[PDB]
Amino acid sequence: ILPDSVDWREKGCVTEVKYQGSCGACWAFSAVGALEAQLKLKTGKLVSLSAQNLVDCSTEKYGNKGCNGGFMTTAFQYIIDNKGIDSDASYPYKAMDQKCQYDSKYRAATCSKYTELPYGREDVLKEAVANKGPVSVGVDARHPSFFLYRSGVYYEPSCTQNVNHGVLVVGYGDLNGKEYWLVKNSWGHNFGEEGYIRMARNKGNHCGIASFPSYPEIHH
Amino acid sequence: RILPDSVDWREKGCVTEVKYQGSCGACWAFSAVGALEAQLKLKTGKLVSLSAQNLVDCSTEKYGNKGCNGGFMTTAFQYIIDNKGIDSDASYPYKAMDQKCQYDSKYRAATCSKYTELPYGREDVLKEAVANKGPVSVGVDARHPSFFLYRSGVYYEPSCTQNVNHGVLVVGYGDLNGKEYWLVKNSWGHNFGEEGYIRMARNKGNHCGIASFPSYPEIHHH
Ligand SMILES: CNC(=O)CCS(=O)(=O)N1CCN(c2ccc3nncn3n2)CC1
Ligand SMILES: CNC(=O)CCS(=O)(=O)N1CCN(c2ccc3nncn3n2)CC1
């Protein structure tokens, strides 16, 4: 039986909200956010990981275009193949495409594998969030309502399953019986609920939130 | 590692005739039914072309697909799961255009119980899956002039990228004159390449993104 509500912030597995700026690196923030929780579960250390390392190094060979978009799964595969990702501290975020400056001397995390959840299954996503950790997802954020969101459970009638924005599901619950996904965004601490959006849950895969979920894992 | 050096699923009667998608970007749909066709043959002993048009018309907005304007092999598989079936090509023929969903369970020729996405860019994992499970849905970069003009041998395009735009089916692998290849069934009719097939470079750094996004469906016992 799954818990009615989950929040990975209460378990000390979620870093401060970041600000992607004018660089379309949401995919990179989504991927490091998921791995940050698994690093905390593995080492007891909460460490922001380097989104810039993914933008600069997980490039053409991973089907990624840095500030012009990419994939959380191919980010995870890069971390696998690369045998690490640097700390945000050692490889900070500049909101630009740069030459790969990865250095193994600044490795903060590894990744052994990743798992893609089945298309559109909100019950499978609930299990994964309860049982495994925060989950990288794509949502359709290409509606003005997403940008103007301030508080409560987000529902956009024009929302589609054509997802274009990488974010991190860090929990779920209900607001007076209105069910939501708790979503960490990468638009800084002033966006929505101090960087978070509660997106309608069990509403026919609303904005494609359960379209393409994935989570990484660390060996041991 | 421990796989056969060559595979060709046409030797097992698991591959249908090459199809012609025409002026409709339904390669995703052809890729998906092609993979499921092999699994249907392995399960029931019968080779039956399945309805790419059924996917175009029915596996739509909900599945992140745009019919003649592109889609995904995985969300196609998910549609066949959710729908509990896919009609035969014969009952629901291909028109190279977007139509209203006309799926009818009276003409169901296959089901799907699950699908599997392979890890990004791992040609050894793709080899195992092709040997051990059957044909595999993949995306390739088919944007380069050289691809349209391919006639024979092993295709290697230095300008190829991992930006894939075209859904096709890996039906085998091997080596020709000291070049390792993937055997790829295309959906541009039998005038294209080797009666509708292209041999694409294998173990050449994930050439044209062939191993970028592989997937295969399965059919369970009940
Ligand atoms: C600039 N914006 C971005 O970089 C965001 C990209 S995203 O989060 O919107 N999303 C990532 C995952 N993706 C798929 C697609 C098919 C699939 N089949 N299996 C997995 N996937 N993943 C779709 C796009
Ligand atoms: C008109 N053209 C088409 O319809 C062809 C589309 S495709 O075959 O080129 N290809 C399908 C698989 N797709 C992904 C992407 C991300 C991902 N992450 N995980 C799995 N995927 N799969 C990429 C696109």
Swiss-Prot record, chain A:
Which reaction is the catalytic activity of this chain?
Similar to cathepsin L, but with much less activity on Z-Phe-Arg-|-NHMec, and more activity on the Z-Val-Val-Arg-|-Xaa compound
Using the UniProt record, give the first listed, main subcellular location.
Answer: other
Cysteine disulfide partners in this protein: 13-111, 23-67, 57-100, 159-207
What residues form the catalytic site here? 26, 165, 185
Q: Name one GO molecular function term.
A: serine-type endopeptidase activity
Q: Which UniProt keywords apply?
A: Cytoplasmic vesicle, Disulfide bond, Glycoprotein, Hydrolase, Lysosome, Protease, Secreted, Signal, Thiol protease, Zymogen
Q: What GO cellular component term, any one, is given?
A: late endosome
Is Lipid biosynthesis given among the entry's keywords? Answer: no
Where does the UniProt annotation locate this protein?
Answer: Lysosome; Secreted; Cytoplasmic vesicle, Phagosome
Q: What is its EC number?
A: 3.4.22.27
Tell me a GO biological process for this protein.
proteolysis involved in protein catabolic process
Say yes or no: keyword Protease present. yes
**Which family is this protein grouped under?**
Belongs to the peptidase C1 family.
Q: In UniProt terms, what function does this protein have?
A: Thiol protease. Key protease responsible for the removal of the invariant chain from MHC class II molecules and MHC class II antigen presentation. The bond-specificity of this proteinase is in part similar to the specificities of cathepsin L.
Subunit comment = Monomer.
Name of the protein this chain belongs to: Cathepsin S
Q: Which part of the entire sequence is included in the shown chain?
A: 114 to 331 of 331
